RNA sequence: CUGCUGAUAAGGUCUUCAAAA
RNA sequence: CAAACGUGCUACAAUGGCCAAUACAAACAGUCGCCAGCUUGUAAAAGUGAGCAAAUCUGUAAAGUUGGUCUCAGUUCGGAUUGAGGGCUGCAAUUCGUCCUCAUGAAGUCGGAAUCACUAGUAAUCGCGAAUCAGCUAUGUCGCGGUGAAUACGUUCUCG
RNA sequence: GGUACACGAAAAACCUUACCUAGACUUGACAUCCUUGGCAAAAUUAUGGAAACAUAAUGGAGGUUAACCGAGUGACAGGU
């Protein structure tokens, strides 16, 4: 006799926790370095 | 409206998924080659002019 | 308006009974380019012929194809209304090809179980001049005999 | 005598072929003029990229042409070089189209 | 019907590339492909009175080299090397101060048989209201007197200011366009007339290339000396 | 005295080693029984075609290395390799092999798909109305 | 469909407005454009004006509409009857 | 070797020029 | 969205459906990526985490072979539609993403007048890769390979 | 019509986008020419906010203004 409620309320609790826990961790990238074309090491 | 769209494309948006790739020579939005940053109709012109090194016509 | 006669590729002798007609009917029952499946169908049908007729499968197959093999062909030629047909003698190669094509077409339509038994029973029935390809050959022969008059004029 | 560089694996790649052969010829000539045992200028499979572009400005997608770009690749590994060969190698001046991927 | 570009069909077989560099990544490949276009377009649209036949660009990880072949390099040089610094600063602004520029002017020998400058002269004459029949006739006769093979000139557009577009062609000599061995130089220019735009396309035949190879050799710059400086 | 042959078909190489032996030929493909390597769809007779009509009682030990192609292409490749190695033993077979044309590369390879076409030669459906 | 660890979603400007108007007794319609926000339990009892594209349609949320998206109870295009071509 | 087989709204560009090189 | 047409995919099935074991490619692509192995999960995937700037590491080949089962039925065909629970991308998936699982199980049993493509590794058929791309019922486009046919007597007719 | 209809579009949830509704701007989101100073633009954190944008903050790379950051300024920019 729940009539929905409980399960979606738990989902809403998780979503509200996520919203309150949002952190500005904006970034764009992954692996770094190792970007070169090499040479005669001094020409 | 093309100059404003070009300038807005150069300007960074406030969301990452807002960003799209436009041609750098012209301003065409669709059919852009990310390998060369140039749309198809300008890539053809550059290849026919010899601007892109190593891009020769293919015979297979 | 071509003035060139097409070449002909080799028929290849069958590597089991050494009879080219076996390879021809394999290629005729080919579907989806499955040589293995077609060969399995043919060899299973021939083994069923062994089990039933108690005679040589190659001899039974030759007796079936020779009996189904037609003699006359009716070529459609329209002039003013409908088409008046023309009886012409066929070459031996096209004769055999038509026989095999009719055999396969009437074999893949019978009411029975797996196509193995289908084609096997069709072959054994055509070996005794009582079958559906037999009816087809009879129909075209009777039609040509009826339209024997216009045989002189072809084109 | 010293070596200071064991197994110097030079790797060459370029959009053009004949320039690559000429550069490898100059390299092997210099490295044989100095006392170094070259393993050999072997070739590697050429990565070919094909781009297909519609000719027309507006319609007729059926009429489209093609372009290719080949990255010809060669390998050459030197066992022991030493300063006597390295100093001579410094003055090679490889043409721009050729690309070096020295790995030490 | 439509014909493939004469230059584009011969590129990579009997013609070298006008820009010779290998970029690091796809992001840099677009920037380097656009900067060279800007430099070439600058040299062609402005400083036009010097008859700049062609400009080639050669780049490494960080160094830009420009080879500008011109018929009258005195206009690029200026009065006691004045405009030279102006164009150097223009190029440096175009690419960046972080790089090293190696601009090099080269006097082109036997200029007349070069489709670029022939087409540029055609367009200038068209824009100057010069009659077309006389203009094309004089250009063709001077090109032939220069000592080359056939030259084909196609001039299309709103001809002489008319309301119906026409086209006028003059072929004088053998111009094998289907042959790949032939040394055919093709150029196209736009004469901006008061009545619109006129398109001039000049094909010029300069013999047959009987030596196999991707050029790596000068093309009609060699008959006189081709030694001009401004480099390091 | 061994013999070596190199056949090819449909982009599938073959290296056939013919060894003189008198204890049954014992054909072998890539260190596996041919009846298990191939689907055994009687394609075995295809590779034995040049080794059947002339002879296999000579009991040649067969060492086959195939890398590439499917199975019909591999069979054709080892057929060509067997023939070419047979050209190194009593060249008198060369005439009989040439007679039925088992000593020529088939030259048939898959064509390249063309733009605007659903395949090598197929074309889109054409509508007029 | 939407992930579990992520949970639900509201723009949180709607959430702040809903909290304020719930603490206030004399509630009025809340004019919102955020059709992407899901109807949280605290939303119950309020009335919203969702931008259908042209106007603001009023939807009264209940203890039942909890869970769906806010703009899902308002439409965007209207079609009611064709006309005979011939 | 003679089956059958009918119709298609109005007005319209397009040669500027040889004086001459 | 009452309807109409074009181009394609899936089928109407025992040359087959499902399950298990298993053999043989080419080309291409990859450091906000390819992702091996392991653990968790019915599964999409998640976590850990090597290897690879690449003839080195990664991107499971499928049809095919054998074995088991179904036994000609609107079915163990066919998957549409529909309800529920989850996964990923993304500020954000309701209008309007796709994937997995569970459940339901439309039409359709070879398609009328009339039409299309194709002359050998071609048609047919089975998979793999790439471009644009954060993600995408692209079944589309451009490429690669595996199996692999039938027919051409002739120009009387038909279109050009 | 053949020579349009898995075509432009080799990727429409936001952006793309050129359309509608609404909230905002005016030598302008972008550029040159001129009289003129550079002792900024970003980015992010607050409040109002559907977001545009406003009021306050760290006042910023640098190189003395090179590029750009401005004021004044009318020619004008701009138009898928
Ligand atoms: Mg514009
Ligand atoms: Mg996008
Ligand atoms: Mg298709
Ligand atoms: Mg039709
Ligand atoms: Mg009639
Ligand atoms: Mg009438
Ligand atoms: Mg089965
Ligand atoms: Mg290995
Ligand atoms: Mg695995
Ligand atoms: Mg099986
Ligand atoms: Mg039914
Ligand atoms: Mg099923
Ligand atoms: Mg949805
Ligand atoms: Mg049924
Ligand atoms: Mg043909
Ligand atoms: Mg939009
Ligand atoms: Mg300061
Ligand atoms: Mg100052
Ligand atoms: Zn472009």
Rounded Cα distance between C137 and C142, Å, is 9
Q: Pairing relation of β-strands G47-51 and G30-32?
A: parallel
Total length of chain F:
129
**E175 lies in some domain:** yes
For F16, F17, F32, F100, the CA distances from F79, given in Å and listed in that order, are: 9, 12, 17, 13
For D9, D18, D37, E24, E26, the CA distances from D101, given in Å and listed in that order, are: 8, 19, 20, 12, 18
For E42, E124, E154, E205, the CA distances from E133, given in Å and listed in that order, are: 31, 14, 12, 22
Q: Pairing relation of β-strands D6-14 and D99-100?
A: antiparallel
E209 and E114 in a common domain: yes
Task: Determine the 3-state secondary structure of C15 from DSSP.
Answer: coil
Q: Are B24 and E20 within 8 A, CB to CB?
A: no
Q: Which residues of E touch A34 (CB under 8 A)?
A: none
Rounded Cα distance between D59 and E187, Å, is 27
Residue pair F75/F47 in contact by the 8 Å Cβ criterion: yes
D70 contacts: CB under 8 Å, gap ≥ 6: B54, D15, D17, D46, D47, D48, D49
Q: Which residues of B touch E16 (CB under 8 A)?
A: 50
What's the number of domains chain E is made of? 2
What's the number of domains chain D is made of? 1
Task: Give the residue from chain A lying closest to E24, CA to CA.
Answer: A37
List alpha helices for chain G, DSSP H. 13-23
**E64 lies in some domain:** yes
Resolution in Å, one decimal, please: 3.2
Work out the angle between the directed axes of helices C20-29 and C92-107 (0-180°, nearest 10).
Answer: 50
Q: Pairing relation of β-strands E19-20 and E52-60?
A: parallel
**How buried is E159 (Cβ within 10 angstroms: 0-12 exposed, 13-18 middle, 19+ buried)?**
middle
Rounded Cα distance between A40 and D86, Å, is 9
E144 and E192 in a common domain: yes
> C1 CA to middle of ligand 15, Å?
14
What is the span of the domain harbouring residue C38?
20-152
Contact residues, chain F to chain C, C-beta under 8 Å: 39, 41-42, 45-46
E129 and E208 in a common domain: yes
Distance of CA C101 to the CA centre of its chain: 4
Rounded Cα distance between G30 and G56, Å, is 10
Rounded Cα distance between C32 and F68, Å, is 23
**E222 lies in some domain:** no
Count the alpha carbons within 13 Å of G20 in the hemisphere toward its beta carbon: 9
Protein residue at shortest CA distance from C1' of I14: C114
What is the span of the domain harbouring residue E152?
110-216
Method used experimentally: cryo-EM
Q: Which nucleotide is nearest to B33 (CA to C1')?
A: I132
Binding residue per annotation — B42?
A: yes
What's the number of domains chain C is made of? 1
E119 and E64 in a common domain: no
Residue pair E72/E49 in contact by the 8 Å Cβ criterion: yes
**C1 lies in some domain:** no
C97 contacts: CB under 8 Å, gap ≥ 6: C24
Count the alpha carbons within 13 Å of B39 in the hemisphere toward its beta carbon: 16
**Nearest chain B CA: its distance from D50 CA (Å):** 8
Max alpha carbon distance in chain A (Å)? 81
Q: What is the DSSP letter of C6?
A: P
Please give the span between the terminal C-alpha atoms of chain B, in angstroms, as a whole number.
41
Q: Which ligand is nearest to the CA of B27?
A: 19
Residue pair F30/F64 in contact by the 8 Å Cβ criterion: yes
> Which chain A residues in 1-43 lie under 8 Å from chain E, judged by CB atoms?
35-37, 39
CATH number reported for the structural domain that contains residue C104 in this entry: 1.10.455.10
What is the span of the domain harbouring residue D8?
3-103
List the domain boundaries for chain G.
2-85
**DSSP class per residue in E192-229:** EETTEEEEEEEEEEEEE--S-SS--S-SSS-SS-----
Count the alpha carbons within 13 Å of E32 in the hemisphere toward its beta carbon: 26
F53: CB within 7 A of chain I nucleic strand: no
Rounded Cα distance between A19 and C144, Å, is 88
Query: Where does a domain end: E84, E109, E134?
Result: E109
List the domain boundaries for chain B.
1-60
Taking residue G37's Cβ as centre, other Cβ atoms within 10 Å add up to 23
Rounded Cα distance between E80 and C33, Å, is 81
Q: Enumerate the β-bridge partners of residue D42.
A: D75
Rounded Cα distance between E91 and E78, Å, is 17
């Amino acid at each position: 006799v729940h009539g929905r409620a409980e399960k979606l309320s738990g989902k809403f609790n998780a979503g509200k926790a996520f919203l309150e826990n949002k952190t500005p961790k904006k970034a764009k990238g992954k692996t770094e370095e190792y970007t070169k074309h090499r040479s005669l090491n001094e020409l | 409206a093309k100059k404003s769209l070009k300038v807005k494309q150069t300007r960074i948006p406030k969301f990452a998924v807002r960003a799209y790739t436009r041609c750098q020579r012209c301003g065409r939005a669709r059919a852009v080659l990310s390998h060369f940053g140039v749309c198809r109709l300008c890539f053809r012109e550059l290849a026919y002019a010899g601007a892109i090194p190593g891009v020769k016509k293919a015979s297979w | 308006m071509r003035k060139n006669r097409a070449p002909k590729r080799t028929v290849l002798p069958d590597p089991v009974f050494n009879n080219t007609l076996v390879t021809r009917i394999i290629n005729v029952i080919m579907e989806d380019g499955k040589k293995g499946l077609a060969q399995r169908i043919l060899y299973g049908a021939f083994d069923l012929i062994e089990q039933r007729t108690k005679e040589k499968p190659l001899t039974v197959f030759e007796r079936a194809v020779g009996n189904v093999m037609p003699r006359l062909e009716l070529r459609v030629r329209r002039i003013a209304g409908s088409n008046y047909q023309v009886p012409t003698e066929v070459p031996q190669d096209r004769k055999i090809a038509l026989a095999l094509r009719w055999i396969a077409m009437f074999a893949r339509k019978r009411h029975e179980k797996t196509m193995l038994e289908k084609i096997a029973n069709e072959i054994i029935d055509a070996s005794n001049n009582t079958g559906a390809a037999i009816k087809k050959k009879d129909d075209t022969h009777k039609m040509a005999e009826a339209n024997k008059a216009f045989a002189h004029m072809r084109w | 005598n010293a070596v200071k560089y064991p197994e110097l694996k030079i790797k060459l790649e370029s959009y053009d072929s004949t320039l690559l052969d000429l550069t490898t010829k100059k390299i092997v000539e210099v490295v044989k003029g100095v006392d170094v045992k070259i393993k050999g200028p072997l070739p590697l499979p050429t990565k070919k990229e094909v781009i297909t572009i519609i000719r027309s400005p507006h319609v007729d997608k059926a009429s489209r042409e093609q372009f290719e770009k080949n990255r010809h690749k060669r390998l050459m590994i030197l066992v022991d070089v030493n300063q006597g060969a390295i100093d001579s190698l410094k003055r090679i001046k490889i043409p721009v189209g050729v690309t070096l991927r020295f790995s030490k | 019907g439509q014909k493939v570009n004469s230059n584009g069909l011969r590129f990579g077989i009997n013609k070298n590339w006008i820009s010779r560099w290998t970029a690091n990544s796809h992001a840099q490949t677009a920037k380097w492909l656009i900067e060279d276009e800007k430099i070439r377009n600058l040299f062609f649209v402005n400083y036009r009175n010097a008859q700049v036949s062609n400009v080639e660009i050669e780049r490494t990880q960080a160094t830009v080299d420009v080879f500008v072949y011109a018929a009258q390099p005195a206009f690029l040089i200026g009065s006691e090397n004045k405009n030279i610094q102006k164009i150097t600063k223009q190029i440096k602004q175009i690419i960046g101060r972080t790089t090293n520029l190696d601009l090099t002017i080269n006097e082109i020998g036997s200029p007349m048989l070069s489709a670029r400058i022939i087409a540029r002269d055609l367009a200038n004459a068209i824009e100057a209201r010069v009659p077309l029949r006389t203009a094309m006739r004089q250009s063709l006769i001077k090109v032939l007197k220069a000592g080359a093979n056939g030259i084909k000139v196609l001039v299309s557009g709103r001809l002489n200011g008319a309301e119906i577009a026409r086209d006028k062609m003059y072929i004088e000599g053998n111009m094998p366009l289907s042959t790949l061995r032939a040394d055919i130089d093709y150029a196209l220019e736009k004469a901006q007339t008061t009545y619109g735009v006129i398109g001039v396309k000049v094909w010029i035949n300069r013999g047959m290339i009987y030596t196999k190879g991707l050029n790596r050799t000068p093309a009609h710059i060699l008959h006189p000396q081709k030694k001009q400086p401004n480099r390091q | 005295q061994s013999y070596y042959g190199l056949g090819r078909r449909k982009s599938s190489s073959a290296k056939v080693y013919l060894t003189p032996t008198q204890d049954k030929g014992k054909i072998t493909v890539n260190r596996r029984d041919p009846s298990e390597y191939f689907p055994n769809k009687l394609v075995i007779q295809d590779m034995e075609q040049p080794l059947d009509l002339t002879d296999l009682k000579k009991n040649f030990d067969i060492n086959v290395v195939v890398k590439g192609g499917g199975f019909t292409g591999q069979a054709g490749a080892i057929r060509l390799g067997i023939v070419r190695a047979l050209l190194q033993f009593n060249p008198e077979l060369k005439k009989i092999l040439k007679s039925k044309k088992l000593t020529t590369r088939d030259k048939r390879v898959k064509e390249r798909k063309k733009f605007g076409l659903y395949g090598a030669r197929r074309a889109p459906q054409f509508t007029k109305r | 469909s939407r992930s579990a660890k992520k949970g639900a979603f509201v723009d949180a400007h709607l959430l702040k407005k809903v909290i304020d108007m719930n603490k206030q007794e004399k509630k009025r319609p809340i004019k919102t454009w955020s059709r992407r926000s899901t109807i949280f339990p605290e939303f119950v009892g309020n009335t919203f004006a969702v931008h259908n594209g042209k106007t603001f349609i009023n939807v009264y949320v209940t203890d039942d509409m909890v869970g769906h998206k806010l703009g899902e109870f308002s439409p965007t295009r209207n079609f009611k009857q064709h006309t005979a071509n011939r």
